[PDB]
Amino acid sequence: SVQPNFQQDKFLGRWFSAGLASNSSWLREKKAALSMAKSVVAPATDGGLNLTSTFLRKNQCETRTMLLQPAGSLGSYSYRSPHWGSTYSVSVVETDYDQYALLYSQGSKGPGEDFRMATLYSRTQTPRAELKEKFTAFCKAQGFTEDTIVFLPQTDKCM
Numbered sequence: 001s002v003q004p005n006f007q008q009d010k011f012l013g014r015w016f017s018a019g020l021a022s023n024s025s026w027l028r029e030k031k032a033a034l035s036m037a038k039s040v041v042a043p044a045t046d047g048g049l050n051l052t053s054t055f056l057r058k059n060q061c062e063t064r065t066m067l068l069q070p071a072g073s074l075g076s077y078s079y080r081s082p083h084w085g086s087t088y089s090v091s092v093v094e095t096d097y098d099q100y101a102l103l104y105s106q107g108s109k110g111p112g113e114d115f116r117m118a119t120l121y122s123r124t125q126t127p128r129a130e131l132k133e134k135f136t137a138f139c140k141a142q143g144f145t146e147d148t149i150v151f152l153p154q155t156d157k158c159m
Contacts, residue, residue, distance in 0.1 A: 001091060001093055001104070002073045002074065002076050002091050002093065003075050006073075006075030006092060006095075007074075007097070008049070008074065011049075011092060011101065012041050012042065014040055015038075015040075015041060015122065015123065016038060016121065016122045016127075016154065017039050017053065017119060017120075017121060017152060018036075018121065018126075018135075018151065018152060019119070019127075019132065019149070019150065020117060020119050020120070020149075020150050020152060021117065021139040021142075021144040021148050021149045021150065022115070022144075022148060022150075023115065023116045023117075023144070024115055024117075025148075027115075027117070028148065031150065031152060032150055032152065032153065033057075034057050034152075034153070035056040035153045035154060035157070036054075036056075036152050036153065036154050037054040037055055037056065037061070037154075037155055037156075037157065037159055038054050038158070038159055039053050039054070039121065040052045040054075044069075046069050047070050048067065048069045048077055050065055050068070051065070051066045051068055052065045052066075053066075054158045055158070061158035066079055067079070071090075075091060075093075076091045077091070081112065084111070084112050085110045085112070086107050086112025086115075087107065087108050087109035088106065088107050088108060088115070089107075089108045090104075090105045091104050091105070093138070094138065098123060099122070099123055099124075099128075100120065100122055100123070100131045100134060101120075101121040102118065102119070102120060102121075102134070102138050103118065103119040103121065104116075104117070104119075105117045105118075116142075116144075118135070118144060120132070132151070135149075136149055
C-alpha cells in the first residue's frame with residue numbers, strides 16, 4: 001500500500017508533523033502536550049531514511065532521530081525500537097512530494113503489533129484545508145474514529 005512509483009530523493013528535506021491518528025490514547029495525549037517544530041528527512045547508509053524530529057517538551061527543545069530501514073516495496077520501511085521491544089512497519093502511502101505525505105505505521109513484531117498510527121506531513125507548517133481533508137479521509141478509511149484524529153500544536157521555537 002505504498003505510493004505508486006515512490007521516489008525517495010523527492011521525499012527528502014523539511015516536513016512539518018501536522019496531524020496524527022492512533023489507536024493509542026496514551027501516545028496521542030503525550031504528542032499533543034508537545035509542540036512540533038520541524039522534521040527533516042535525510043538519506044541513510046542502509047539505503048533508507050533518517051527521520052529527525054524537533055519538538056518542544058515542557059518549554060525545552062528536544063530532538064529525536066529514527067532510522068527507517070528499507071523493508072519491501074519502495075516507500076516501505078521498518079523501524080526497530082529497543083525501548084518498546086518491537087518493530088514497526090512504516091509506509092509512505094500517499095504523497096505528491098511538494099505539499100503533503102501520508103505515513104502509516106503498525107507493529108510487525110513484539111507487543112507493538114497492537115499499535116497503529118497515521119501521520120500527516122506537510123511542506124508548510126499550516127496545511128491548506130484540502131490537505132487536512134486528505135488526511136482525515138485517509139484516517140477514516142483506515143478505521144480511525146473521529147476522536148483518535150489529532151491536529152498537532154506547532155511552535156516557531158527550536159529554530
